[PDB]
Amino acid sequence: PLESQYQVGPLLGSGGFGSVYSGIRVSDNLPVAIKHVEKDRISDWGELPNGTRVPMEVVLLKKVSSGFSGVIRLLDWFERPDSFVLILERPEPVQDLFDFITERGALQEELARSFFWQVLEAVRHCHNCGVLHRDIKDENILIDLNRGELKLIDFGSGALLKDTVYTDFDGTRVYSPPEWIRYHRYHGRSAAVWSLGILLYDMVCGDIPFEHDEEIIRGQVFFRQRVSSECQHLIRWCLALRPSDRPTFEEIQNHPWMQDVLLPQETAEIHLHS
Numbered sequence: 569p570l571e572s573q574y575q576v577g578p579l580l581g582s583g584g585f586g587s588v589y590s591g592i593r594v595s596d597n598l599p600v601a602i603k604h605v606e607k608d609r610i611s612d613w614g615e616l617p618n619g620t621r622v623p624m625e626v627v628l629l630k631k632v633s634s635g636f637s638g639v640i641r642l643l644d645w646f647e648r649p650d651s652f653v654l655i656l657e658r659p660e661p662v663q664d665l666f667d668f669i670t671e672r673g674a675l676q677e678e679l680a681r682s683f684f685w686q687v688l689e690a691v692r693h694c695h696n697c698g699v700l701h702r703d704i705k706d707e708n709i710l711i712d713l714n715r716g717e718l719k720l721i722d723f724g725s726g727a728l729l730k731d732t733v734y735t736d737f738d739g740t741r742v743y744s745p746p747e748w749i750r751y752h753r754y755h756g757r758s759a760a761v762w763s764l765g766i767l768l769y770d771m772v773c774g775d776i777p778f779e780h781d782e783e784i785i786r787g788q789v790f791f792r793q794r795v796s797s798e799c800q801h802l803i804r805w806c807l808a809l810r811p812s813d814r815p816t817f818e819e820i821q822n823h824p825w826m827q828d829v830l831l832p833q834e835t836a837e838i839h840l841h842s
């Protein structure tokens with residue numbers, strides 16, 4: 569087989585997650601993203617079904633791929649002396665929500681709803697596979713600008729979903745819930761909704777609501793943009809200080825504000841100039 573069944577191209581990014589490149593599988597000219605991750609820089613490791621030692625990101629990806637959307641799928645992977653190449657899909661054209669928001673500030677609610685709903689369905693998929701993303705935010709959400717579809721990325725901070733309490737966290741602090749900041753404890757589903765909460769605000773206000781820990785723990789939300797009474801209610805519910813006062817995924821999707829969402833294609837036709 570060998571590593572060379574792909575034709576490497578530019579650098580689409582780099583940072584904490586690793587270093588992502590623009591490849592094109594030679595086998596059938598299909599666009600792909602190539603993520604190198606040094607062995608030495610990995611923290612969390614798991615073991616694949618077949619019984620071999622890989623980074624948790626690979627285990628999670630594998631569980632969450634299989635079937636369609638919501639998530640960038642992992643087509644293949646390789647092990648090198650001091651790293652791990654991950655071959656992932658590269659749909660196009662594409663922009664991550666952080667960049668998108670940075671460019672156009674806060675979004676309209678009709679657009680935030682399409683995006684938030686799509687995000688919601690992708691998190692549901694992740695939980696069904698037994699994966700908890702743990703780092704849901706605007707930087708880890710790609711937007712296929714042509715088809716109007718969002719896809720999840722970067723599981724390097726995730727963990728196997730479980731019903732017991734989590735006493736470890738390595739994602740984004742400002743998206744982490746109050747219960748983590750105060751006792752270093754949290755339950756996946758509860759904590760997920762909280763980050764989803766921060767993300768909804770972020771979309772409709774053009775920036776995150778909490779910057780400091782003193783603001784997370786307090787849990788009072790100030791709105792800087794014109795935002796509908798209904799959208800404010802859902803953001804505040806998703807950010808209930810008490811984890812069990814936060815909504816379920818079902819509750820979030822049956823909320824008045826999430827009715828009559830636009831379909832991916834419609835969404836691009838109206839808001840992405842596509």
Ligand SMILES: O=c1cc(-c2cc(O)c(O)c(O)c2)oc2cc(O)cc(O)c12
Nearest residue numbers: 580581585588601640656657662721722
């Ligand atoms: O598939 C992509 C794709 C990109 C990507 C692609 C672009 O075309 C681009 O402009 C980016 O900023 C990121 O970034 C990442 C980061 C990760 O940590 C995991 C991933 O699977 C990906």
